[PDB]
Amino acid sequence: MLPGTFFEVLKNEGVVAIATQGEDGPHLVNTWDSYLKVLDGNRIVVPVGGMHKTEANVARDERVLMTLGSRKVAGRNGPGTGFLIRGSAAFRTDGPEFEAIARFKWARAALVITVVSAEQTL
Amino acid sequence: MLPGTFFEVLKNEGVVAIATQGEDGPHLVNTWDSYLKVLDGNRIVVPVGGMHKTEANVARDERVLMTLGSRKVAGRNGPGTGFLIRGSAAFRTDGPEFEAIARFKWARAALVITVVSAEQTL
Ligand SMILES: Cc1cc2nc3c(=O)[nH]c(=O)nc-3n(C[C@H](O)[C@H](O)[C@H](O)COP(=O)(O)O)c2cc1C
Numbered sequence: 001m002l003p004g005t006f007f008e009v010l011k012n013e014g015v016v017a018i019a020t021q022g023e024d025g026p027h028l029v030n031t032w033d034s035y036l037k038v039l040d041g042n043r044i045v046v047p048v049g050g051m052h053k054t055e056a057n058v059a060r061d062e063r064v065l066m067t068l069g070s071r072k073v074a075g076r077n078g079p080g081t082g083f084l085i086r087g088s089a090a091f092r093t094d095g096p097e098f099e100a101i102a103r104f105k106w107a108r109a110a111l112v113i114t115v116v117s118a119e120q121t122l
Numbered sequence: 123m124l125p126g127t128f129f130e131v132l133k134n135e136g137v138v139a140i141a142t143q144g145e146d147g148p149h150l151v152n153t154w155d156s157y158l159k160v161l162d163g164n165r166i167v168v169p170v171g172g173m174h175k176t177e178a179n180v181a182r183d184e185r186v187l188m189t190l191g192s193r194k195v196a197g198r199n200g201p202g203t204g205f206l207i208r209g210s211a212a213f214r215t216d217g218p219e220f221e222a223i224a225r226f227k228w229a230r231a232a233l234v235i236t237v238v239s240a241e242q243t244l
């Protein structure tokens with residue numbers, strides 16, 4: 001379901017933001033555009049070094065939001081676009097989903113986001 | 123309280139993410155590094171075109187989170203850094219905080235974030 005324009009954004013560097021639901025409000029962490037590995041079946045994989053609070057939140061509520069964008073990709077009304085991604089998160093520590101990001105020697109896990117919707121917001 | 127390194131990030135284009143507490147989980151929206159207007163008294167101002175869900179959330183819970191970063195600014199262990207900003211939000215349609223972003227003629231409002239903490243997370 002992830003559209004072509006989303007893959008165009010991924011070709012460009014940028015800050016990715018990942019929101020979770022915590023006990024006393026939202027939490028928000030980051031990765032890089034270039035770190036994302038997209039697999040078939042609508043899966044975005046993120047290398048996890050920290051994300052301990054994020055992981056605790058996902059354990060309680062699997063639903064996450066992700067945003068990313070680039071000034072270098074054309075939006076609907078001018079240069080620059082981005083996306084709001086909604087999906088369910090899981091943390092993997094073995095198997096193909098972990099191997100997808102195992103190149104990162106600091107990785108303790110793979111954050112796997114199964115995408116339910118992708119909206120171009122610009 | 124906002125540190126020099128944060129202002130170095132703002133010299134570079136990038137995607138800013140703003141998380142709020144929604145009715146059924148977090149909400150997450152964006153602006154650009156170059157749109158942020160920093161005022162005395164630890165205030166960050168964002169031009170508001172949409173942000174209708176965000177405004178509804180802020181009306182009920184003023185606490186917000188913001189992230190931003192850049193590969194072009196050195197972090198602690200290599201190239202690239204970014205920030206987690208925590209603060210309280212208000213929406214303004216007049217006064218000096220609105221005038222700060224009034225040059226954006228599509229702006230219906232100014233989102234004013236009064237910063238309580240700024241953490242360099244990389
Ligand atoms: C631009 C940027 C990229 C980041 N990339 C990662 C990353 O790929 N993996 C990771 O675990 N943390 C990364 N971090 C740090 C996380 O955003 C977060 O601060 C840290 O993992 C702690 O997560 P937690 O608050 O859920 O415990 C990055 C931070 C920034 C500013």
Ligand SMILES: Cc1cc2nc3c(=O)[nH]c(=O)nc-3n(C[C@H](O)[C@H](O)[C@H](O)COP(=O)(O)O)c2cc1C
Nearest residue numbers: 069082121151152153169170171172173174175176
């Ligand atoms: C890179 C990027 C920059 C954006 N800049 C703004 C902005 O400056 N002001 C704004 O109102 N919306 C901006 N948007 C759209 C918002 O993220 C959001 O989708 C829209 O304001 C609707 O907000 P809401 O879901 O809270 O109703 C931007 C989106 C992207 C991807």
